[PDB]
Design a protein around this ligand. Structure first.
Ligand SMILES: CCCCCCCCCCCCCCCCCC(=O)OC[C@H](COP(=O)([O-])OCC(O)COP(=O)([O-])OC[C@@H](COC(=O)CCCCCCCCCCCCCCCCC)OC(=O)CCCCCCCCCCCCCCCCC)OC(=O)CCCCCCCCCCCCCCCCC
Ligand SMILES: CCCCCCCCCCCCCCCCCC(=O)OC[C@H](COP(=O)([O-])OCC(O)COP(=O)([O-])OC[C@@H](COC(=O)CCCCCCCCCCCCCCCCC)OC(=O)CCCCCCCCCCCCCCCCC)OC(=O)CCCCCCCCCCCCCCCCC
Ligand SMILES: CCCCCCCCCCCCCCCCC[C@@H](O)O[C@H](CO[C@H](O)CCCCCCCCCCCCCCC)COP(=O)(O)OCC[N+](C)(C)C
Ligand SMILES: CCCCCCCCCCCCCCCCC[C@@H](O)O[C@H](CO[C@H](O)CCCCCCCCCCCCCCC)COP(=O)(O)OCC[N+](C)(C)C
Ligand SMILES: CCCCCCCC/C=C\CCCCCCCC(=O)O[C@H](COC(=O)CCCCCCC/C=C/CCCCCCCC)COP(=O)(O)OCCN
Ligand SMILES: *OP(=O)(O)OCC(C)(C)[C@@H](O)C(=O)NCCC(=O)NCCSC(=O)CCCCCCCCCCC
Lengths: 175, 53, 178, 459, 70, 56, 88
């Protein structure tokens, strides 16, 4: 369906076998699906076509809101309240977007596990690896900030992580 | 009142965040970027203090 | 249940209560009727071998060893009639019992159904109203001074009188109301 | 925010100029209209807040509390209509005036953007409640009850005021937005420890915290029904809202200052729950159950995690509705029997079946049956506590079991068994009581369909 | 067999009346609401997403999809 | 009957009039804070040909 | 359930039926008003056994305080009728 992007939500080509009856006994499943089609799918389709033509008679649009980029907390003065307000709002929007990215990857993983069947342990390696990377990045960014989280605390956590990384790199180089 | 609350417009911006995340994931998978990055702010704009210990 | 209790049980009542309990538990042990008949005749023979004894002291020494022997071999899961206090349907119909006074709170559209029943009910109410004023004085003069000695009630002695405190005994809900 | 405040103020002249026989009708209708108007505050953003002016602002933490506050007033009027029948017109108008003034003070307190303003209204809520308890209370203990409810509160809140002005002489502001944006860490110092205690104890005493809870059973069992409703549903949540607001300036001291209270809560919720197992008064049992739920809310706030805050908000709303319903049911029994003892009126399911259904639904909601929002809050708090320490589950688990027990205990003693023979004055339930229970219980089951409304600002 | 007996029970008039009244008022307002929602869904709603034409600045209510929300 | 039921039901206008007055009061407060209208870095916009203010 | 509504005649008939199968008492001598100790020359243990046979016959138990003072078939019938709410 065109309602979603196929690249953002990938799917395998979905190869299905062909009916190969081996006996002369008529299977009840095919007849049941034919009567289901005739008694259910046709009236539902007709009602849908009526509703779709009514919707086509009245077509109107809504838009995705675009947000400009503003200076972040790393270029705000100590007490400049307006810049910190703008940077805090931008950081909160970015936090929400990152949460939704993690949600997309988790949906991919769950769909893979259901789809692959008994061979999910081997056939869902890529989704597991992607989720591992995204989870690691999200945990590095946002974990342990508390309920009163803010952009300043995230910046402090990043600064401490970079200090630790720099110290470890200098210690390893000067080994 | 229940009907009014049910149809409250999306000022919390859930679907907006979903669309933004979709576009970001598409772009980063297309160009090979590693999805989410570990650093929230790029280190080019942070001036760490020299320890010199 | 219906009979008023006494201050104590005499020796004869205790012996008879033991006899009934022992026979019931022996029946619970002996499921089949012929086995129960045989062992119940044996228990009857064992019970009346001291029937003719005269002194109280040893007769009380018996019925004590008898209680101990009963408690040792008392069949920890005896048969209980289903309506008895331990039975599987003891208070089963207790939730269907509604007091009569609830009918006084019915809507007039509800009392419009069943007019004959409510006419008879009004007759009963007026009968109770007169009988109560008679009953209070009857109980007042029939009671010994210092208060009752036993919770037994007298009958009516006059012609138009009713037994004192009769309303809540006569107007019991039912054994199986619904 | 004045679109809600001004009509609430106009309730007073409308009450006083009303006809002698039309006070209840007008008050109920216009309170319901004010609740409908206040429903519009629920449209919140994922961004900062609804900053209406320099004085008032609204959040997704404040909006559900405001809606609950505005919704409770018509229910309180309906509950008070019965036992105030033989009262003079002037005193009935004074009662309604006290209720309106309480609603006004609460409305302003939730939306105040200044800590000092918040303190003033947070204390102003005391006077109407004290008057209601000590004037229209029934027993002679009410006077003592009132004293307790007063002094405990004041004993906690006088230090807070000091701390507050001290803070404003150091940071220069008590505005909550500036306080949040300019937050600075609290160093481990004795002065900082005592500032923490001063900022925390006033909100702890009103939750109430275990060991500081002695005023609550007295006040709730001695108050009239409307007083019990407002005390259990709204006034307890003032401490939770205050602690949620003020913990932003207390870090990182809370990392280790929270230990004595957490223990006092985690053990305390056990004790109070067990207390409910041996209680001879219905109102006392309901009050102790309130203490247990608020202990869970205290744990949630002290843990200071997103899931903790979401669970605390949801549990506050759910407990408000549930405890108000339980108090109303107990009062509907009391007005028939005049005893307030659990084992006097028995087997009431046979005489009042629909009221028995209301009892069952209220007990199920207090028992936290999924997917009620009571269980949503409880489960979020339990998960956050498990992340805090895996051992906590033990205590949490125990509480769950105990809660169910006493809840069903209260349902079995009063509704099941055989009716008491000599009690012959149990009349059919009025439409007013049934409507009161329905208006309590329908919003809960409706809210379970859109839990995001009551999950707070961290959703 | 004409052994029909009177069943003593509490009055069901008031509970039934309350249930009827509550159902009546809830339905009184909710049936028109359901009908209106159905008509709006069938005949009007479900706007479709589009790109913002250049030089055009949309109104704040044009960023929402459902007609009732708009 | 008009001029008789008014003396008993004039009370029912107080709360709605309070609501309208409260809305009007809210609007007045908004005017005072217009210090940054169309001046934020996020919503800075060029005015339409027949537009004086971005919001009211 | 499907239990027929037993009557006073049925109760009396069943009580007399059980008593006539007690070989200690002569079926010619006994009647509805025939006393147990004086008219038929029975003992207290015999009375206990008779009460137990009644209980087995009618499927319910008579408490001992009430059972100990049931000395005629007529009072047994009356007790069963009062317990089971028999009209006629
Ligand atoms: C389950 C599906 C139902 C679908 C059909 C529609 C159901 C409508 C339910 C409406 C909401 C509850 C209303 C409560 C007030 C009742 C007012 C009243 O007096 O009625 C008397 C009326 C007339 O009777 P009467 O002759 O006067 O009675 C005389 C005596 O009073 C004797 O009275 P009684 O003995 O008949 O007592 C009433 C009866 C019933 O009364 C009640 O118990 C009402 C309250 C039950 C729930 C208690 C809170 C639990 C948390 C619920 C949170 C979810 C809410 C969902 C949204 C609700 C929106 C309102 O008592 C019970 O049977 C015990 C109920 C125990 C339920 C345990 C399971 C609960 C959770 C089930 C799962 C739900 C989510 C599934 C998710 C996964 C799948 C999608 O009888 C009824 O209307 C009974 C209704 C049948 C019970 C409905 C229970 C299922 C619905 C639960 C809530 C809605 C779920 C929607 C999704 C379903 C899928
Ligand atoms: C106690 C009670 C207290 C109550 C307090 C107040 C209640 C508060 C609740 C407010 C909630 C309102 C709301 O948000 O609406 C919800 C929602 C509104 O949806 P929406 O977002 O506005 O529209 C979505 C799209 O934008 C547009 O969708 P669309 O345009 O594609 O759909 C077309 C349109 C119409 O669709 C159609 O006409 C056709 C579609 C179905 C036809 C299928 C084929 C049949 C025809 C074939 C046969 C004839 C033709 C051929 C003949 C020849 C045959 C051979 O659909 C509708 O209009 C939905 C109607 C539902 C309106 C309900 C309004 C609620 C009123 C609130 C007050 C309630 C008071 C109670 C009394 C109300 C009355 C009972 O409506 C529903 O959810 C309906 C239920 C759908 C569920 C389907 C089954 C789910 C079961 C799965 C689980 C199973 C396991 C268990
Ligand atoms: C009694 C016998 C049975 C008769 C009834 C039979 C019919 C059964 C139906 C009853 C329940 C069955 C469940 C069916 C659910 C369908 C409706 C549901 O989908 O709507 C929900 C909506 O529910 C409401 O949001 C929640 C109700 C609001 C509660 C507010 C309370 C009202 C004020 C009262 C005072 C407040 C007191 C408490 C203060 C906190 C969730 O909708 P959602 O998928 O999300 O989006 C709506 C559509 N959009 C996308 C266009 C936006
Ligand atoms: C009654 C019902 C319940 C009411 C509510 C109860 C909750 C209030 C409990 C108060 C919380 C604790 C207060 C202080 C905690 C700080 C930690 C400190 O006490 O522990 C050690 C402190 O050691 C000793 O505790 C020193 C103080 C000993 C004297 C205090 C009295 C001890 C018991 C008093 C309890 C009375 C409470 C009721 C008052 C009426 C740590 O050693 P040290 O590293 O050196 O100090 C660190 C702090 N620095 C950095 C500022 C220096
Ligand atoms: C339900 C009953 C509860 C009663 C209230 C319990 C809470 C008590 C909290 C302490 C009371 C005083 C709070 C002080 C107000 C905050 C201001 C502040 O923190 O400033 C401090 C001042 O801190 C103090 O002076 C506090 C000293 C304590 C004096 C009052 C003692 C009250 C009782 C103390 C023990 C009980 C506290 C816990 C009680 C638990 C509940 C019973 C720094 O002062 P500076 O000199 O300017 O800075 C230092 C660098 N030059
Ligand atoms: O004429 P009645 O009024 O019927 O009097 C009956 C009787 C005279 C026998 C009796 O009431 C009485 O008064 N007896 C006087 C002496 C007396 O009874 N002394 C006590 C004898 S005790 C006894 O009978 C031995 C009991 C043996 C049975 C033990 C039960 C164990 C069973 C274990 C479970 C299966």
């Amino acid at each position: 369906p065109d309602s979603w992007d196929k690249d953002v939500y990938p799917e395998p080509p979905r190869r299905t076998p062909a009916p190969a009856p081996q006996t002369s006994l008529p299977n009840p499943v095919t007849y049941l699906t034919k009567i289901f089609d005739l008694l259910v799918d046709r009236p539902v389709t007709l009602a849908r076509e009526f509703i779709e033509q009514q919707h086509a008679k009245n077509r109107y649009y809504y838009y995705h809101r675009e947000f400009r980029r503003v200076p972040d907390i790393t270029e705000c003065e100590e007490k400049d309240i307006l810049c910190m307000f703008e940077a805090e709002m931008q950081w909160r929007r970015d936090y929400k977007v990152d949460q939704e990215i993690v949600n997309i990857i988790q949906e991919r993983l769950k769909a893979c596990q259901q789809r692959e069947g008994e061979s999910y342990r081997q056939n869902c390696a890529k989704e597991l690896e992607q989720f591992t990377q995204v989870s690691k990045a999200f945990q590095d960014r946002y974990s342990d900030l508390g309920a009163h989280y803010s952009a300043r605390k995230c910046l402090a956590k990043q600064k401490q992580r970079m200090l630790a990384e720099r110290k470890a790199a200098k210690e390893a180089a000067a080994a | 009142g229940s009907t009014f609350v049910a149809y409250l417009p999306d000022y919390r911006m859930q679907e907006w965040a979903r669309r933004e995340a979709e576009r970001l994931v598409k772009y980063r998978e297309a160009n090979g970027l590693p999805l989410m990055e570990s650093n929230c702010f790029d280190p080019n704009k942070i001036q760490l203090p020299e320890d010199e210990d | 249940a219906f009979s008023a209790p006494a201050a104590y049980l005499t020796h004869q009542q205790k012996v008879l209560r033991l006899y009934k309990r022992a026979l019931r538990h022996l029946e619970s042990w002996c499921v089949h009727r012929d086995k129960y008949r045989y062992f119940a005749c044996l228990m009857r023979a064992r019970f009346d071998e001291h029937k003719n004894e005269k002194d109280m002291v040893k007769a009380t020494q018996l019925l004590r060893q008898a209680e101990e022997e009963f408690w040792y071999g008392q069949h920890p899961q005896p048969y209980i009639f289903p309506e008895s206090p331990g039975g599987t349907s003891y208070e089963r119909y207790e939730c269907y019992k509604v007091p009569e006074w609830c009918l006084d709170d019915w809507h007039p559209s509800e009392k419009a159904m069943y007019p004959d029943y409510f006419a008879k009910r009004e007759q009963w109410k007026r009968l109770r109203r007169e009988s109560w004023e008679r009953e209070v004085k009857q109980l007042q003069e029939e009671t010994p001074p210092g208060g009752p000695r036993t919770e037994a009630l007298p009958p009516a002695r006059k012609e138009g009188d009713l037994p004192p405190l009769w309303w809540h005994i006569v107007t019991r809900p039912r054994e199986r109301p619904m | 925010m004045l679109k809600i405040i001004i009509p609430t103020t106009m309730l007073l002249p409308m009450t006083w100029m009303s006809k002698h026989n039309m006070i209840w009708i007008n008050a109920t209708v216009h309170s319901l209209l004010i609740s409908l108007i206040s429903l519009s505050l629920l449209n919140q953003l994922g961004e900062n807040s609804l900053n209406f002016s320099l004085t008032f602002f609204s959040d997704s933490l404040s909006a559900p509390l405001l809606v609950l506050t505005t919704w409770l007033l018509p229910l309180m009027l309906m509950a008070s209509q019965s036992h105030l029948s033989k009262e003079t017109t002037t005193r009935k108008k004074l009662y309604i005036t006290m209720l309106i003034l309480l609603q006004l003070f609460l409305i302003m307190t939730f939306t105040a953007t200044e800590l000092i303003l918040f303190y003033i209204l947070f204390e102003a809520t005391l006077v109407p409640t004290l008057i209601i308890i000590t004037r229209w209370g029934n027993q002679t203990e009410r006077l003592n009850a009132g004293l307790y409810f007063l002094f405990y509160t004041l004993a906690g809140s006088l230090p807070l005021l000091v701390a507050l002005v001290y803070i404003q002489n150091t940071t220069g502001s008590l505005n909550f937005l500036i306080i949040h944006y300019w937050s600075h860490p609290l160093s481990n110092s004795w002065s900082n420890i005592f500032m923490w205690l001063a900022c925390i104890m006033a909100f702890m005493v009103k939750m109430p915290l275990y060991g500081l809870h002695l005023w609550l059973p007295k006040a709730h069992v001695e108050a009239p029904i409307a007083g019990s409703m407002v005390l259990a549903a709204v006034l307890l949540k003032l401490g939770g809202y205050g602690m949620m607001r003020i913990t932003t300036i207390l870090n990182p001291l809370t990392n280790y200052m929270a230990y004595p209270f957490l223990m006092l809560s985690m053990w305390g919720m056990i004790m109070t729950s067990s207390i409910c197992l041996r209680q001879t008064d219905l109102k006392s049992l309901i009050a102790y159950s309130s203490v247990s739920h608020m202990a869970l809310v205290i744990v949630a706030i002290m843990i200071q995690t997103p899931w903790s805050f979401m669970g605390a908000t949801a549990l506050m709303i759910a407990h408000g509705l549930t405890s108000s319903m339980l108090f109303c049911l107990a009062n509907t029994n009391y007005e028939r029997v005049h005893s307030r003892t659990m084992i006097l009126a028995r087997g009431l399911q046979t005489l009042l079946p629909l009221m028995a259904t209301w009892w069952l639904v209220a007990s199920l909601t207090n028992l936290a049956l999924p997917p009620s929002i009571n269980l949503i809050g409880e489960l979020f708090i339990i998960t956050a506590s498990f992340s805090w320490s895996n051992i906590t589950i033990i205590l949490m688990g125990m509480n769950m079991m105990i809660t169910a027990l006493y809840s069903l205990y209260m349902l079995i003693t009063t509704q099941r068994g055989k009716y008491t023979h000599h009690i012959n004055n149990i009349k059919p339930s009025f439409t007013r009581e049934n409507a009161l229970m329905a208006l309590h219980i329908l919003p809960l089951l409706l809210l379970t369909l859109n839990p995001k409304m009551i999950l707070g600002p961290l959703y | 067999h004409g052994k029909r007996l009177f069943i003593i029970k509490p009055s069901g008039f008031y509970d039934r009346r309350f249930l009827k009244l509550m159902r009546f008022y809830i339905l009184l307002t909710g049936i028109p609401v359901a009908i209106g929602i159905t008509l709006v869904n069938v005949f009007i709603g479900e706007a479709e997403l589009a790109d913002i034409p250049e030089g055009y600045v949309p109104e704040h209510w044009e960023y929402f999809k459902h007609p009732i929300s708009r | 009957n008009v001029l008789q039921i008014v003396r008993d039901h004039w009370v029912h206008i107080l709360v709605p009039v309070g609501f309208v007055f409260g809305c009007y009061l809210d609007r007045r407060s908004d005017e005072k804070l217009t210090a940054f209208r169309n001046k934020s870095l996020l919503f800075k916009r060029e005015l339409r040909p027949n537009e004086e203010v971005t919001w009211k | 359930s499907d239990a027929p509504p037993l009557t006073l005649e049925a109760i009396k008939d069943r009580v007399l039926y059980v008593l006539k199968l007690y070989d200690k008492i002569d079926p010619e001598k006994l009647s509805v008003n025939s006393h147990f100790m004086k008219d038929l020359g029975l003992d207290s243990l015999d009375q206990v056994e008779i009460i137990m046979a009644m209980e087995d016959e009618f499927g319910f138990e008579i408490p001992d305080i009430d059972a100990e003072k049931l000395m005629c078939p007529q009072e047994i019938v009356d007790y069963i009728a009062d317990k089971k709410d028999v009209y006629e």
